[PDB]
């Protein structure tokens, strides 16, 4: 599914509002990308389905910190 | 002339049988409704 | 019965069970040929088999 493995960001629903204020149901999808992260501690690359926001979270916290959250959640990588 | 009901037990069971109902979520809902109604026959069987 | 059968051993109860099952067979043959006047005997034999089997069960895993 279109779910960020880091933040949990998923498709949300809302409306397209026209100039005439006609509401039509829509979705806002997360900016998802499958990215290979180098994990020094495991001497292996880990491919995660992450939003650009989640990628910034990994830049701040570090991949080991983020992967530890995934283990605690039971979420495999 | 040729009428709409042309029998076949194999096609009867494959299309409406117990196992066919059990195979999908919506078919298990058919069985659940029929059980709540208190139906004697849930499906056509042997 | 039930108290009298409880005193018997596992080997003894297995013998009585075989005897009751032989009697059950002979009574069924007698009933089926229309030769059994005492219809009540079938229920007595059937419930004795039940008593023997119940006691064998409480002696095997207790």
């Amino acid at each position: 599914s279109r779910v960020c493995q880091v933040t949990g960001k998923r498709p949300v629903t809302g409306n397209n509002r026209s100039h005439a204020l006609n509401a039509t149901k829509r979705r806002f999808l997360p900016n998802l990308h499958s990215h290979r992260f180098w994990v020094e501690s495991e001497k292996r690359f880990v491919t995660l389905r992450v939003s650009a926001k989640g990628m910034r979270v990994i830049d701040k916290k570090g991949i080991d910190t983020v992967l530890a959250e995934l283990r605690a959640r039971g979420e495999k990588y | 002339m040729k009428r709409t009901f042309q029998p076949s037990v194999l096609k009867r069971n494959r299309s409406h049988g117990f196992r066919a109902r059990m195979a999908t979520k919506n078919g298990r809902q058919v069985l659940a409704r029929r059980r709540a109604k208190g139906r004697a026959r849930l499906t056509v069987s042997k | 019965k039930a108290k009298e059968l409880r005193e018997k051993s596992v080997e003894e109860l297995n013998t009585e069970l075989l005897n009751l099952l032989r009697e059950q067979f002979n009574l069924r043959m007698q009933a089926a040929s229309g030769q059994l006047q005492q219809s009540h005997l079938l229920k007595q034999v059937r419930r004795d088999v039940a008593r023997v089997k119940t006691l064998l069960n409480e002696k095997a895993g207790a």
């Binding site: - | - | 069970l17 099952l21 043959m29």
Partner: protein
């Protein structure tokens, strides 16, 4: 292959009729009601131990119980197994 407890429960009743009488007189065959789940091997062994006679061959069929209508509601008699137990030339019972 066998067990006495099983053999004692396998034979249910002699079946009486004109066909059963003629099968005995002409072919030395006894007609029985046997347990529904009884196999030809079980019926052979049970007749040999309990009736003390030698069995040549066992033939079996399943009889479908008749349905009777009682107004709007139906009744159904039980299906049962019939055995044609042929005994060897030397006849006893």
């Amino acid at each position: 292959m066998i067990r006495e407890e099983r053999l004692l429960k396998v034979l249910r009743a002699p079946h009486v009729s004109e066909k059963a009488s003629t099968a005995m007189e002409k072919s030395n065959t006894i007609v029985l009601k046997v347990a529904k789940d009884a196999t030809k091997a079980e019926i052979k062994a049970a007749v040999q131990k309990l009736f003390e006679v030698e069995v040549e061959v066992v033939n079996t069929l399943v009889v479908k119980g008749k349905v009777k209508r009682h107004g709007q509601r139906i009744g159904r008699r039980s299906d049962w197994k019939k055995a044609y137990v042929t005994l060897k030339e030397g006849q006893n019972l």
